[PDB]
Design a protein around this motif. Structure first.
Motif, PDB file in Angstrom:
ATOM      1  N   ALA A 136      27.572 106.758 128.341  1.00 19.74           N
ATOM      2  CA  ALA A 136      27.885 107.562 127.729  1.00 19.74           C
ATOM      3  C   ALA A 136      27.540 108.561 126.344  1.00 19.74           C
ATOM      4  O   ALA A 136      27.191 109.291 126.405  1.00 19.74           O
ATOM      5  CB  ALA A 136      29.346 108.315 128.148  1.00 19.74           C
ATOM      6  N   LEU A 161      28.578 117.566 132.216  1.00 23.78           N
ATOM      7  CA  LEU A 161      28.796 116.164 132.616  1.00 23.78           C
ATOM      8  C   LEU A 161      28.974 115.231 131.838  1.00 23.78           C
ATOM      9  O   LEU A 161      30.074 114.732 132.341  1.00 23.78           O
ATOM     10  CB  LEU A 161      27.669 116.187 133.458  1.00 23.78           C
ATOM     11  CG  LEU A 161      27.372 117.601 134.918  1.00 23.78           C
ATOM     12  CD1 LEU A 161      25.999 117.817 135.414  1.00 23.78           C
ATOM     13  CD2 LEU A 161      28.286 117.498 135.428  1.00 23.78           C
ATOM     14  N   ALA A 162      28.878 115.284 130.728  1.00 29.15           N
ATOM     15  CA  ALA A 162      28.326 114.043 130.174  1.00 29.15           C
ATOM     16  C   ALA A 162      30.338 113.596 129.616  1.00 29.15           C
ATOM     17  O   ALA A 162      30.577 112.510 129.429  1.00 29.15           O
ATOM     18  CB  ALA A 162      27.132 113.549 128.923  1.00 29.15           C
ATOM     19  N   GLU A 178      32.684 114.671 130.591  1.00 33.23           N
ATOM     20  CA  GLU A 178      33.567 113.894 131.543  1.00 33.23           C
ATOM     21  C   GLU A 178      32.969 112.771 132.225  1.00 33.23           C
ATOM     22  O   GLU A 178      34.004 111.973 132.287  1.00 33.23           O
ATOM     23  CB  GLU A 178      33.201 114.686 132.872  1.00 33.23           C
ATOM     24  CG  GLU A 178      34.184 114.542 134.288  1.00 33.23           C
ATOM     25  CD  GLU A 178      35.941 115.265 133.861  1.00 33.23           C
ATOM     26  OE1 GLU A 178      35.999 115.793 132.743  1.00 33.23           O
ATOM     27  OE2 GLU A 178      37.033 114.484 134.380  1.00 33.23           O
ATOM     28  N   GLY A 179      32.044 111.662 131.216  1.00 41.62           N
ATOM     29  CA  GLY A 179      32.113 110.464 132.107  1.00 41.62           C
ATOM     30  C   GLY A 179      31.237 110.307 132.716  1.00 41.62           C
ATOM     31  O   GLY A 179      31.553 109.073 133.720  1.00 41.62           O
ATOM     32  N   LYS A 180      30.501 111.649 133.444  1.00 41.71           N
ATOM     33  CA  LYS A 180      29.279 111.053 134.751  1.00 41.71           C
ATOM     34  C   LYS A 180      27.991 110.876 133.701  1.00 41.71           C
ATOM     35  O   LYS A 180      27.839 110.809 132.889  1.00 41.71           O
ATOM     36  CB  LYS A 180      29.424 112.425 135.640  1.00 41.71           C
ATOM     37  CG  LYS A 180      30.542 113.126 136.473  1.00 41.71           C
ATOM     38  CD  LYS A 180      30.316 114.132 136.446  1.00 41.71           C
ATOM     39  CE  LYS A 180      31.538 114.387 137.954  1.00 41.71           C
ATOM     40  NZ  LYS A 180      32.435 113.629 138.755  1.00 41.71           N
ATOM     41  N   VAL A 181      27.044 110.219 135.319  1.00 40.72           N
ATOM     42  CA  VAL A 181      25.794 109.468 135.029  1.00 40.72           C
ATOM     43  C   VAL A 181      24.810 110.095 135.792  1.00 40.72           C
ATOM     44  O   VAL A 181      23.536 110.365 135.111  1.00 40.72           O
ATOM     45  CB  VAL A 181      26.026 108.448 134.685  1.00 40.72           C
ATOM     46  CG1 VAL A 181      26.853 107.220 133.291  1.00 40.72           C
ATOM     47  CG2 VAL A 181      27.183 107.071 135.406  1.00 40.72           C
ATOM     48  N   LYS A 182      25.240 109.618 137.176  1.00 42.43           N
ATOM     49  CA  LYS A 182      24.005 109.767 138.265  1.00 42.43           C
ATOM     50  C   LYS A 182      24.249 111.662 137.980  1.00 42.43           C
ATOM     51  O   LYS A 182      22.831 111.618 138.467  1.00 42.43           O
ATOM     52  CB  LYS A 182      24.600 109.502 139.126  1.00 42.43           C
ATOM     53  CG  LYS A 182      26.611 109.607 139.491  1.00 42.43           C
ATOM     54  CD  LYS A 182      26.660 108.687 140.976  1.00 42.43           C
ATOM     55  CE  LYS A 182      25.680 109.454 142.566  1.00 42.43           C
ATOM     56  NZ  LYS A 182      26.540 108.657 143.564  1.00 42.43           N
ATOM     57  N   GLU A 183      25.095 112.191 137.911  1.00 42.12           N
ATOM     58  CA  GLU A 183      24.804 113.039 137.847  1.00 42.12           C
ATOM     59  C   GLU A 183      24.367 114.278 136.328  1.00 42.12           C
ATOM     60  O   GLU A 183      23.260 114.826 136.822  1.00 42.12           O
ATOM     61  CB  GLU A 183      26.338 114.426 137.693  1.00 42.12           C
ATOM     62  CG  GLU A 183      26.503 114.862 138.994  1.00 42.12           C
ATOM     63  CD  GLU A 183      27.651 113.317 139.490  1.00 42.12           C
ATOM     64  OE1 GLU A 183      27.573 112.632 138.577  1.00 42.12           O
ATOM     65  OE2 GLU A 183      28.141 112.778 140.542  1.00 42.12           O
TER      66      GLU A 183
END
Length: 428
Positions: free
Chosen positions: A255, A310-311, A313-318
Motif C-alpha cells: 500500500a 482509497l489507499a 483505507e488499505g484498498k488495492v483493487k479499487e
C-alpha cells in the motif's frame, strides 16, 4: 579634363574582358529556379490555376513568400534583358539607347535599388510576422489578417518608389560602374558635395538597420519557438510520468508503494495543469479548446485524490480500477490537444527555418554592399586604386544581384520530403 575616380565610367563600349557568358548562364539558372518554384507553388499551395479540394488555409508567411518570389521574377524580367543586350551587343547602357542615352542606366539603377529595398522590407515583414506568431497571437489576429499577405507588397512597392525618387530630384544621382552592365548608386565621391554622399549614407544605414531588425526578430522567434518546445517537452514528460505511475499502480503490491505512486502522479498533474499551449494564448480560458482540457485535468486531480483516499483505507483493487478509469479518460482529453500542439510547432519550425535560411543569405549578400558604401563617404578615397578596388566593387554588386538566383533555388529545398523529415524529426 579631370580624371574621375571611376576609371571606365564614360567608356562607350563595354570594357574589354571575359566572363560575359557567365552572366547569361547565371540568369538562365535563376529563371529556371524561379519557374520551378512558381510551378511547385501552383501545384502544392496557393495555386489558383483551378479548383483543388483541400486548399490549405493560406498562411501570411506563404503569402509573403509568394509575393517576394513574384517581385524577384519581375525584377529579373526587367533587368536581365538590358544586361543581355549589352553583353551580346558589346555596348554600354549609357549609349545603348540613343533616345534614352543616360536613362537606360538611370532607370536601371533605380530599379536595382527599388527591388533591393523591396526585398529587404518584405524580409523584415516576414520576420515581424514570424516573431508575432509565437509570442503575440492576440495582436496577430487583431491586425495581421489574410489580406495583409497581399496588401504588404503594394505598400512596400509604393514606399520603395517614394524612397528611390530622391536621386531623380538631385540627392545622389546615379553613375555607371566599369563593366557597362552594372549601374548603381554612386558610392565613392571625392567631391565632398554633402547632397550626394547623404543619399548613399542614408540608403546604407537604412539597409543596415533593416537587416539588424530582421536578425533581432529572427532571434526572438527562435527564442519563442524554443520556449514552446520546452513547454511541449515538459508536457510529454508529465504524460510519461503519469503513464509510469499508472503502470506501477496496476502492479504494485504494498500500500505504501501505491500511495507514493499516487502522490507523484498528483504532483505531476498539478505541475501539468498550469501549462499553456503555444498558440492558444490569445483567448481566455473559457473557449472549448482550453476549457475541456482544464476540466479533464480537474477530473484527473479528483480521481487521483479519490485513489489516495482509497489507499489510505488499505484498498488495492479499487485503486487499480480508479487508475484504469483515469487511463481511459485521460486519452480523449489530452492526446488530441497534444497532437494539435505538435503540428502547430512543426509548422512554426518550418516557417522559422525558411525565414532563417533566407535572411542568412540576405545578410551575407548585403553586408559587402554596405561595407563598400561606407568605404566611400567616410574612409578616404584619394585614388587608392582603380582596378583592385573596382574588382571588389564588381564582386559586391554580383553578390547583391545573386540574391535572386539563390532565393529561388533555396526555397525549392523546402518542397522536398527528405529535407523536412530530417528537420521535422530533429525537432519533434
Amino acid at each position: 579634363m579631370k580624371s574621375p575616380f571611376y576609371r571606365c565610367q564614360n567608356t562607350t563600349s563595354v570594357e574589354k574582358g571575359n566572363s560575359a557568358v557567365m552572366g547569361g548562364v547565371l540568369f538562365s539558372t535563376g529563371l529556371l529556379g524561379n519557374l520551378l518554384a512558381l510551378g511547385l507553388l501552383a501545384r502544392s499551395g496557393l495555386g489558383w490555376c483551378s479548383r483543388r479540394p483541400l486548399r490549405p488555409l493560406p498562411s501570411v508567411f506563404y503569402m509573403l513568400v509568394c509575393g517576394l518570389t513574384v517581385t524577384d521574377l519581375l525584377g529579373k524580367c526587367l533587368l536581365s534583358p538590358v544586361v543581355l543586350a549589352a553583353y551580346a551587343q558589346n555596348r554600354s547602357l549609357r549609349v545603348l539607347a540613343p533616345a534614352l542615352d543616360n536613362s537606360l542606366c538611370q532607370a536601371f539603377a533605380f530599379f536595382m535599388s527599388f527591388f533591393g529595398l523591396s526585398s529587404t522590407l518584405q524580409l523584415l515583414a516576414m520576420a515581424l510576422e514570424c516573431w508575432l506568431s509565437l509570442g503575440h497571437p492576440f495582436f496577430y489576429r487583431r491586425h495581421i489578417t489574410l489580406r495583409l499577405g497581399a496588401l504588404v507588397a503594394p505598400v512596400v512597392s509604393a514606399f520603395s518608389l517614394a524612397f528611390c525618387a530622391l536621386p531623380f530630384m538631385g540627392f545622389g544621382k546615379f553613375v555607371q560602374y566599369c563593366p557597362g552592365t552594372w549601374c548603381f548608386i554612386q558610392m565613392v565621391h571625392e567631391e565632398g558635395s554633402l547632397s550626394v554622399l547623404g543619399y548613399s549614407v542614408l540608403y546604407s544605414s537604412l539597409m543596415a538597420l533593416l537587416v539588424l531588425a530582421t536578425v533581432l526578430c529572427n532571434l526572438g522567434a527562435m527564442r519563442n519557438l524554443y520556449a514552446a518546445r520546452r513547454q511541449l517537452a515538459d508536457l510529454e514528460d508529465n504524460w510519461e510520468t503519469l503513464n509510469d505511475n499508472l503502470k506501477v499502480i496496476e502492479k504494485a503490491d504494498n500500500a505504501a508503494q501505491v500511495k507514493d505512486a499516487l502522490t507523484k502522479m498528483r504532483a505531476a498533474a498539478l505541475d501539468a495543469q498550469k501549462a499553456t499551449p503555444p498558440k492558444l494564448e490569445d483567448k481566455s480560458p473559457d473557449s472549448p479548446e482550453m476549457k475541456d482540457f482544464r476540466h479533464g485535468f480537474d477530473i484527473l486531480v479528483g480521481q487521483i485524490d479519490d485513489a489516495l483516499k482509497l489507499a489510505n483505507e488499505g484498498k488495492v483493487k479499487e485503486a487499480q480500477a480508479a487508475a484504469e478509469q483515469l487511463k481511459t479518460t485521460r486519452n480523449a482529453y489530452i492526446q488530441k490537444y497534444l497532437e494539435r500542439a505538435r503540428s502547430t510547432l512543426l509548422e512554426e519550425l518550418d516557417h522559422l527555418l525558411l525565414l532563417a535560411l533566407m535572411t542568412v543569405l540576405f545578410t551575407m549578400c548585403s553586408l559587402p554592399v554596405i561595407y563598400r558604401a561606407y568605404y566611400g563617404a567616410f574612409k578616404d578615397v584619394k585614388e587608392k586604386n582603380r582596378t583592385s578596388e573596382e574588382a571588389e566593387d564588381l564582386r559586391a554588386l554580383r553578390f547583391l544581384s545573386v540574391i535572386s538566383i539563390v532565393d529561388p533555388w533555396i526555397f525549392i529545398i523546402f518542397r522536398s520530403p527528405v529535407f523536412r523529415i530530417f528537420f521535422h524529426k530533429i525537432f519533434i
